[PDB]
Amino acid sequence: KKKYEHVLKCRLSNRQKALYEDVILQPGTQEALKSGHFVNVLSIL
Secondary structure: OOOOOOOOOOOOOHHHHHHHHHHOOOHHHHHHHHHOOHHHHOOOO
16 A cells, blocks of 8 residues: 454354254255265255
């Protein structure tokens, strides 16, 4: 010549915790994480 990057962690909500743990229980997620092929993980995105 003004710019400085400062990214820091953010905070979660317990309703979001409940809903996330709710959705987590689909077994297709398990077989996907084990297989490592995108044909299944496309959904959870």
